[PDB]
Design a protein around this ligand. Structure first.
Ligand SMILES: [Zn+2]
Ligand SMILES: [Zn+2]
Length: 70
């Protein structure tokens, strides 16, 4: 699945992921993309605060879903 992550500046990061990727995995991908350390990252999808050890499917994140770094 393709997802979008919007940075604090509104920059778009396009990520290739799998339903079962954890939020931890996503944070490492964001690190590689923009150099933001994972401890510095806080993610939201549809107003839910996302936990590192849960998966994209766990939050009903889907193809073309947008996430926000907050
Ligand atoms: Zn895909
Ligand atoms: Zn993965």
């Amino acid at each position: 699945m393709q997802i979008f992550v919007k940075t604090l500046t509104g920059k778009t990061i396009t990520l290739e992921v799998e339903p079962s990727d954890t939020i931890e995995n996503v944070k490492a991908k964001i690190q590689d993309k923009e150099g933001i350390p994972p401890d510095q990252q806080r993610l939201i999808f549809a107003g839910k605060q996302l936990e590192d050890g849960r998966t994209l499917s766990d939050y009903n994140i889907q193809k073309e879903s947008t996430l926000h770094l907050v």
